[PDB]
Design a binder for these strands. Structure first.
Ligand SMILES: [Zn+2]
Lengths: 403, 42
RNA sequence: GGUAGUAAUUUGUACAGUUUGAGGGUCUAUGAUACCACCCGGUACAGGAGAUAACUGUACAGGCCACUG
């Protein structure tokens, strides 16, 4: 079993040269001879990188090349190579991209006045619920507090209730209050989903879900300290909306997953613009104990973790600042080509790229790690491989258009 | 009628050929060292 | 609540194989005819491996009071 897959000694020099020419042809077709006989399948003499498919003979390699999948994969590789040689954008191109991102932000972006209107909606909710549930209170969470979602995004409100009360009963009597109140109509059991009568914006009510509020506040802080982050996240969200990847019901990714990916890109740039919650600075930190770590609360220009604090924004000598459009093109390059979304976790907490084997994750499609929910896969809505390929194709086409 | 792409068999087609692989040789002079471009007469 | 299994049925992807279709050939001067005897090359390249739909089986992602507590 330790012998070579193809023995040069047994073959003549003329035969050896002929086989070398055949292997050069196979290399041009992305077929590579096995260096050693596989223990499980020693019969195979070659492998196809495009499909990672074992091939018994050279004729089998040609048969595989004839197959449509090989043609599709070689076309994909050719597109990748073509994208690789695209020049970085010129200063005028970067300025144009930044202007486009700003225009997208203005057209579809949450502003301070939208937040005040949403606070007024929550005030109406508190007014109507006060009569029946004085103890209960309402807060903004999700897209509302973050300011990184669109202005048309549905209002999201979270209820704080006493410990004695239970989430199902609380949601039920909240549903009852929504039933009787005139302000809220087209109410449905579903969270409790309703349509605001006066404002006219879709409204959603939730109980518990403390992790969602934590991630929303973390992203709100990241946006506040990092000015370029908000335009980038808004532009990426607009791209997702145009491509329909934002819609969950169609198999697309959730909205804030795009913001998480944007902050991950900003953190993983050659010059890191944002820090990692967990790093080698922490004493006793390790990937094996990564699950033990968790994020507790968000402070002003500070973070809390438990197994100590970390700064929300990196403090470095002469930290670099670059245009928003440059960061957007860099993100397109980072995700379309630079980052293999298949088997590398988008882990904000740790600088190192967490392997799927560590989290026993599918390794199939786009994967994002929640800042506060380590065991939760926020990309589970994307469960179809064709949709995964659709996202990759969309990202590559966007890179090509913008490059 | 024409020499096959692999193993150099006229009557045998490339797909039909089941013989063991053989070196590709220049038809003009039947020389392994010289290809079609490097034919001595050329 | 978690793991897997799961008849009858619902999507998606190919096609190892079958079969139907138009197309593809190019390349004639190089004739050997007739139901008297039918087939060789010079015009004519490169290192280049040759289909899409109807059809059969097989693993793989979702749907299914499927399915479980
Ligand atoms: Zn042949």
């Amino acid at each position: 079993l330790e012998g070579p897959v193809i023995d040069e000694s047994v073959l003549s020099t003329k035969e050896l040269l002929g086989l070398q020419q055949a292997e050069e042809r196979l290399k041009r077709d992305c077929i590579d001879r096995l260096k050693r006989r596989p223990r499980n399948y020693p019969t195979a003499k070659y492998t196809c990188r495009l499909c990672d498919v074992l091939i018994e003979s050279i004729a089998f390699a040609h048969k595989h090349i004839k197959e449509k999948r090989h043609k599709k994969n070689i076309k994909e590789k050719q597109e990748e190579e073509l994208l690789t040689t695209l020049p970085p954008p010129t200063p005028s191109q970067i300025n144009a991209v930044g202007i486009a991102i700003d225009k997208v932000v203005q057209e579809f972006g949450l502003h301070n006045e939208n937040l005040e209107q949403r606070l007024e909606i929550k005030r109406i909710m508190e007014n109507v619920f006060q009569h029946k549930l004085p103890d209960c209170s309402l807060r903004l969470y999700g897209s509302s507090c973050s300011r990184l979602g669109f202005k048309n995004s549905d209002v999201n409100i979270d209820i704080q209730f006493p410990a004695i009360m239970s989430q199902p009963d609380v949601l039920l009597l909240v549903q009852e209050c929504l039933k009787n109140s005139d302000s809220f109509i087209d109410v449905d059991a579903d969270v409790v989903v309703c349509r605001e009568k006066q404002s006219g914006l879709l409204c959603k009510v939730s109980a518990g879900n403390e992790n969602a509020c934590l991630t929303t506040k973390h992203l709100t802080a990241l946006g506040k300290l990092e000015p370029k982050l908000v335009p980038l996240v808004i532009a990426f969200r607009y791209w997702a909306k145009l491509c329909s990847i934002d819609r969950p019901e169609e198999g697309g990714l959730p909205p804030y997953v795009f913001a998480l990916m944007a902050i991950f890109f900003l953190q993983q740039r050659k010059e890191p613009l944002l820090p990692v919650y967990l790093g080698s600075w922490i004493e006793g930190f390790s990937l094996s104990k990564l699950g033990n770590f968790n994020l507790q609360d968000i402070e002003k220009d500070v973070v809390i973790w438990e197994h100590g604090q970390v700064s929300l924004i990196l403090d470095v000598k002469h930290q670099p600042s670059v245009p928003v459009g440059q960061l957007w093109v860099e993100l397109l390059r980072f995700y379309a080509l630079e980052f293999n979304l298949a088997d590398l976790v988008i882990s904000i907490r740790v600088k190192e790229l967490v392997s799927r084997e560590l989290k026993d994750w599918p390794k199939k499609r786009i994967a994002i790690e929640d800042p506060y929910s380590v065991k939760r896969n926020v990309a589970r809505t994307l469960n179809s491989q064709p949709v995964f390929e659709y996202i990759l194709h969309c990202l590559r086409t966007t890179y090509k258009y913008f490059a | 009628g024409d020499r096959c792409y692999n193993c150099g068999g006229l009557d045998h087609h490339a797909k039909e050929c089941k013989l063991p692989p053989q070196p590709k040789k220049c038809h003009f002079c039947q020389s392994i060292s010289h290809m079609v471009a490097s034919c001595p007469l050329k």
